[PDB]
Amino acid sequence: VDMYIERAGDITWEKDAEVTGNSPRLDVALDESGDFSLVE
Amino acid sequence: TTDGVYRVMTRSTQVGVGVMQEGVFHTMWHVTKGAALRSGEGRLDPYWGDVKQDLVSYCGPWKLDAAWDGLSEVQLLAVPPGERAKNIQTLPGIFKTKDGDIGAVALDYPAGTSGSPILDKCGRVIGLYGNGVVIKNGSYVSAITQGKR
Ligand SMILES: N=C(N)N[C@@H]1CCCCNC(=O)[C@H](CCCCN)NC(=O)[C@H](Cc2ccc(O)c(N)c2)NC(=O)Cc2cccc(c2)CNC(=O)CNC1=O
């Protein structure tokens, strides 16, 4: 079970990047196992 | 252990992504479950982790301390399986929890993109992508998950 890493890039901000996605405001809960769920 | 963003692979399948900064490798716990990592010919051992935060660091303590300012657009430096690293800009939403608000990004990528860094305009890593919720239409919203340095 060989788990390994390989470099993929430099960490930089890219000027004039594509902007997408909305900005949802959600009520959520986080349990002790690190799982988020919606509060409905 | 040169600074940068890395794919986390198993042998190959990409199971996630992480950040090398200040000699410490940072990823989400669910990517590795704390298992040791090979880097070229060297072994990286876990140092710190927290299941509830879904984070783990290797070779030293968590180094990423920048925080979302609660106002500005951010960039996901997405490293999807089989695709080159790319930056996607977005205005975060909010996870409202009993313990406070967490910035959150409504960007949906394959599971193996877990651990991709989220950046502020100075290029600082304000958290990692990939612990989130599935909303009613089936799309995904990720917390901006950041540790404590
Ligand atoms: N479902 C999607 N549209 N997009 C997701 C994006 C995955 C991005 C990387 N993160 C992960 O893999 C983590 C791992 C586990 C970390 C746990 N502490 N994941 C997640 O947070 C969520 C957690 C979750 C699960 C169910 C929920 O009701 C809520 N509130 C939250 N886990 C999933 O969605 C699983 C899932 C659910 C439904 C359909 C799919 C996958 C099929 N989609 C894909 O295989 C690729 N896309 C996908 O898998």
Side-chain angles (χ1 to χ4, degrees), chain A residues 33-38, chain B residues 28 30 51 54 107-115 129-135 138-142:
Chain A
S33 302
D35 293 342
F36 290 108
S37 58
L38 301 173
Chain B
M28 301 212 78
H30 73 257
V51 164
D54 193 16
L107 299 171
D108 199 352
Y109 283 88
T113 319
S114 293
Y129 173 87
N131 196 21
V133 297
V134 179
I135 60 173
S139 63
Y140 183 75
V141 185
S142 178

Side-chain angles (χ1 to χ4, degrees), chain A residues 7-14 17 19-20, chain B residues 5 73-79 84-85 87-90 117-120 122-124:
Chain A
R7 203 170 182 280
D10 296 4
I11 298 174
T12 56
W13 178 274
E14 298 304 295
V19 190
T20 190
Chain B
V5 64
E73 295 178 2
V74 304
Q75 280 181 9
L76 172 68
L77 201 187
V79 187
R84 72 166 192 78
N87 289 57
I88 312 296
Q89 191 159 321
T90 194
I118 300 165
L119 311 183
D120 68 21
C122 291
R124 300 185 299 172

Side-chain angles (χ1 to χ4, degrees), chain B residues 5-10 12-40 42-85 87-95 97-120 122:
Chain B
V5 64
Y6 288 72
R7 303 175 195 270
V8 181
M9 312 290 297
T10 59
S12 278
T13 303
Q14 180 175 318
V15 294
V17 180
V19 171
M20 195 74 74
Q21 183 176 308
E22 289 173 79
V24 170
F25 191 68
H26 305 79
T27 190
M28 301 212 78
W29 173 83
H30 73 257
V31 171
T32 67
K33 312 286 197 304
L37 302 172
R38 180 170 72 74
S39 193
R43 175 181 170 161
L44 309 188
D45 289 330
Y47 188 95
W48 170 87
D50 186 296
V51 164
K52 183 176 181 173
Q53 300 181 52
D54 193 16
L55 293 177
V56 61
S57 67
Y58 290 75
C59 305
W62 189 270
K63 300 286 177 175
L64 315 179
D65 52 1
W68 185 43
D69 66 6
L71 182 68
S72 301
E73 295 178 2
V74 304
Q75 280 181 9
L76 172 68
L77 201 187
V79 187
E83 295 177 15
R84 72 166 192 78
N87 289 57
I88 312 296
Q89 191 159 321
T90 194
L91 181 70
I94 304 289
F95 284 178
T97 82
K98 62 178 189 196
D99 295 321
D101 292 354
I102 313 169
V105 296
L107 299 171
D108 199 352
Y109 283 88
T113 319
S114 293
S116 292
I118 300 165
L119 311 183
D120 68 21
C122 291

